Design an enzyme around this catalytic site. Structure first.
Site: not given
Length: 297
Positions: A195, A229-235, A273
Site C-alpha cells: 500500500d 491498476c487504479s489510475a492505470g499509469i503507475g503500477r 508515475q
C-alpha cells in the site's frame, strides 16, 4: 501535451540511455541518479481543453489522468448514441520495438464504466486482463467488475469457468459471450503490491510477466493485453515497461529503460508515475538479468 510542447515531445521521442547488462546492475546500486533522470521525463498529461466529449469527466476515476487522443481506445457498441457511450479512459500502448497495440492501459473501472470496460475487452478481442490493485487500499481504488461465477454487463456476458491460486496473484479463466459468439480471457489479479511502497521483491511481478508472455505467444491474431491498476499509469506502467525491457534484455542483451518509459508516456500520459516506480522497474530488470545466461565468453 506539455507547457513547452516541442521541447517535451522532442525529448520523449529522442531521450535514450542504452544500458549494457553491467551498467544496468550499477545503475540500481546507485538509486540516486535514477531520480534525477526520472524528473527529466515529461508527464505528457492531457490538457482537458484538448479533448471534447461532454461529461467525459463522469467516467474518469482521476480527473487529471486522461487518455491522450492519438491513442485513445474508442468504443463501438453497435447500438448507442450517448456519445459518452463511445468513451473510456484507456489507451493503446506500443510494445517492444514499437509493436502497435501490444497492450491497452486503462484505469480501474468505476460503477458507471463496467459495461464500457467489457465492451472494450470484447471489441478488442483482448485475451488477457492484468489487474494490479486491491479494490480498496485505505480508500477505494477500483470497483469489483467481474462475477463470482456469472454476470451480464450490457450486451456482454462473462462466465468464470475456473480459479487458480498462485504466488501473489490469482488467475480467473473467463468466457465472454455475445449471442452466438464466445471469447476466452484470462484475468490475473495481483493483490500483493504494498500500500505504501513498491514491492520488496520483483519476483512475483516477473512470474506474472512470464505467465502473461506465454499467453501472448499462444494468442497470435488476437488483441492487446489489457492492464490496469487504479489510475492505470503507475503500477500499470511498471508492468508494461518491465515486460518490454525484459524482452529487450533477452533478445539484445541490453535495455533502454529511459527510451521505454518515454515511449509509454507518449502512448498514455503519466505511465510509470513516481521515481520509486521508475527505480522499481530497474530493480525488476536487474532481477531478470540476474537469471540470464552469462555474458563472459
Amino acid at each position: 501535451g506539455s507547457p513547452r510542447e516541442k521541447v517535451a515531445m522532442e525529448y520523449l521521442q529522442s531521450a535514450s540511455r542504452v544500458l549494457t547488462r553491467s551498467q544496468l546492475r550499477d545503475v540500481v546500486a546507485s538509486s540516486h541518479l535514477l531520480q534525477s533522470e526520472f524528473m527529466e521525463i515529461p508527464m505528457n498529461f492531457v490538457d482537458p481543453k484538448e479533448i471534447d466529449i461532454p461529461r467525459h469527466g463522469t467516467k474518469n476515476r482521476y480527473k487529471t489522468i486522461l487518455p491522450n487522443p492519438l491513442s485513445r481506445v474508442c468504443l463501438r457498441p453497435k447500438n448507442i448514441t450517448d456519445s459518452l457511450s463511445t468513451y473510456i479512459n484507456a489507451n493503446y500502448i506500443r510494445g517492444y520495438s514499437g509493436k502497435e497495440k501490444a497492450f491497452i492501459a486503462t484505469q480501474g473501472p468505476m460503477i458507471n464504466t463496467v459495461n464500457d470496460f467489457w465492451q472494450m475487452v470484447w471489441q478488442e478481442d483482448s485475451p488477457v486482463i492484468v489487474m494490479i490493485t486491491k479494490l480498496k487500499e485505505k480508500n477505494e481504488k477500483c470497483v469489483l467488475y467481474w462475477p463470482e461465477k456469472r454476470g451480464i454487463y450490457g450486451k456482454v456476458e462473462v462466465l468464470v469457468t475456473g480459479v487458480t491460486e498462485c504466488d501473489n496473484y490469482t488467475i480467473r479463466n473467463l468466457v465472454l459471450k455475445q449471442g452466438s459468439h464466445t471469447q476466452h480471457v484470462k484475468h490475473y489479479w495481483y493483490t500483493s503490491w504494498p500500500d505504501h511502497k513498491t514491492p520488496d521483491s520483483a519476483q512475483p511481478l516477473l512470474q506474472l510477466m512470464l505467465d502473461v508472455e506465454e499467453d501472448r505467444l499462444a494468442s497470435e491474431g488476437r488483441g492487446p493485453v489489457v492492464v490496469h491498476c487504479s489510475a492505470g499509469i503507475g503500477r500499470t506502467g511498471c508492468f508494461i515497461a518491465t515486460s518490454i525491457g525484459c524482452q529487450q534484455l533477452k533478445e539484445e542483451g541490453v535495455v533502454d529503460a529511459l527510451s521505454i518509459v518515454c515511449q509509454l508516456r507518449v502512448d498514455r500520459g503519466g505511465m510509470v508515475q513516481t521515481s520509486e516506480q521508475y527505480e522499481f522497474v530497474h530493480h525488476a530488470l536487474c532481477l531478470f538479468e540476474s537469471r540470464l545466461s552469462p555474458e563472459t565468453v
